[PDB]
């Protein structure tokens, strides 16, 4: 049985980055050559694993995380990076074992006058731990005065919209991201390439 990579890569709609999606993959045969030999992806960088060995490796579980960001932020989806997306939305671990796949989606995720479905967290008083997902909407207290849950001066709503317009520069255009995580536990590996089946 193959792995349902099409559900993740070829999904109709993607999640906002602050509420990034995660799909568990197990008990299937994966064909990573379909992905590395695609040229549809502008970004395909692996960490802690080498890409050409993937078809000959097994793992206990593979997690695919999917979300949308803008072009200038694709570089933040890497270990050790900082910035608004890596600090407040989606953080990779320093010891990351997996791959980061991205591609431009300006045609799917833009609307004339702005597509506002895709949001990001702009304010947070602490950085995320790796793979932490914060979907709360508390008012962010920028000063010393309690905000009482009321938006206002020094009391920011923490989320903001990308507002993807098809006329934005490539840096401000939507990019779909899929992060694969290769997890190897003391348990029978169930996700293998075609060669290790």
């Amino acid at each position, epitope marked *: 049985n193959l792995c349902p990579f099409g559900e993740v890569f070829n999904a109709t709609r993607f999640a906002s980055v602050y509420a990034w999606n995660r799909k568990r993959i197990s008990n299937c045969v994966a064909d990573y050559s379909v992905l590395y030999n695609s040229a549809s992806f502008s970004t395909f960088k692996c960490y802690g694993v080498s890409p050409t060995k993937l078809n000959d490796l097994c793992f206990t579980n593979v997690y695919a995380d999917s979300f949308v960001i803008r072009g200038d932020e694709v570089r933040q989806i890497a270990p050790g990076q900082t910035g608004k997306i890596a600090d407040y939305n989606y953080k990779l671990p320093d010891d990351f074992t997996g791959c980061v796949i991205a591609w431009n989606s300006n045609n799917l995720d833009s*609307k004339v*006058g*702005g597509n*506002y479905n895709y949001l990001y967290r*702009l304010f947070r008083k602490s950085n995320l731990k790796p793979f932490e997902r914060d979907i709360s909407t508390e008012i962010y207290q920028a000063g010393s005065t309690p905000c009482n849950g009321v938006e*206002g001066f020094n009391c920011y*709503f923490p989320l*903001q919209s990308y507002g993807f317009q098809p006329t934005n520069g490539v840096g401000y255009q939507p990019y779909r991201v899929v992060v694969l995580s290769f997890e190897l536990l003391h348990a029978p590996a169930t996700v293998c390439g075609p060669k290790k089946s």
Partner: antibody, heavy 123, light 107 residues
Framework: EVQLVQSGAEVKKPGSSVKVSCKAS????????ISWVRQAPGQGLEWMGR????????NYAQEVQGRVTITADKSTSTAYMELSSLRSEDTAVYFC????????????????WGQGTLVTVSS | EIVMTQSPATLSVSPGERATLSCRAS??????LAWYQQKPGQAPRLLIY???TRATGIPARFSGSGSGTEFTLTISSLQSEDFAVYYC????????FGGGTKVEIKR
């Protein structure tokens, strides 16, 4: 671009409630959020609240919290403002607005406005 | 809080003249400053955002300038329709409206 058409004027008794509608004639609002701004006769503009339709979350100003409910039906491209426990001080014109934000500034400015809805409260 | 002060409350200028309206912020709002025009009996409309960027369809005789705490709205040749109330509004740290300037016909 965006055309905002509001419901008609209302004469209401104290203690009652009113619900004002605001329809985007384009089939969409094309904004992150939609605010309601009120103006008492001869006075300036006071922000009351906004709804973020994507999240279904509404933020209200302190002066009306508990008395006001802002909603948005995505199917009909219509925002609503329901003010209750009406007092005579609520006599004002109420405008709906599409909000626009410029990162990293945290405030909205209002690039499109409905025509306004007069709400007279009197015994 | 950011306090927005408009001066003067009433600006009496004759038709076809230049009009200059002042908006002062009690602390810096950078260029996150908007101007609205409210004609009699009508809803406000956006004239300027970003301190100096005209909203779409706004004619070039309206222009804004300033950054920080001192802003101005200039009308290069007053037209009968331009006699109205004008509001500035910061949106740097949430929002604050100015009190309004009435551009009145000087006679």
């Amino acid at each position: 671009e965006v055309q905002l058409v509001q419901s008609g004027a209302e004469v209401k008794k104290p203690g009652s409630s009113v619900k004002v509608s605001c329809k985007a004639s384009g089939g969409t609002f094309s904004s992150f959020s939609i605010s309601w701004v009120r103006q008492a006769p001869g006075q300036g503009l006071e922000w009351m609240g906004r709804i973020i339709p994507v999240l279904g979350i509404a933020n209200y100003a302190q002066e009306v919290q508990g008395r006001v409910t802002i909603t948005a039906d995505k199917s009909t491209s219509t925002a609503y403002m329901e003010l209750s426990s009406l007092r005579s001080e609520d006599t004002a014109v109420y405008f709906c607005t599409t909000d626009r934000f410029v990162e990293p500034a945290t405030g909205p400015f209002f690039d499109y406005w409905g025509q306004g809805t007069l709400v007279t409260v009197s015994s | 809080e950011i306090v927005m002060t408009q001066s003067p409350a009433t600006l009496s200028v004759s038709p076809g003249e230049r009009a200059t309206l002042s908006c002062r912020a009690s602390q810096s709002v950078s260029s996150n400053l908007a101007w609205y025009q409210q004609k009699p009996g009508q809803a406000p409309r956006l004239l300027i955002y970003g301190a100096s960027t005209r909203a779409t369809g706004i004619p070039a005789r309206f222009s804004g300038s300033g950054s920080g705490t001192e802003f101005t709205l200039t009308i290069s040749s007053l037209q009968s329709e331009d006699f109205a109330v004008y509001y500035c509004q910061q949106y740097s740290n949430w929002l604050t409206f100015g009190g309004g300037t009435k551009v009145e016909i000087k006679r």
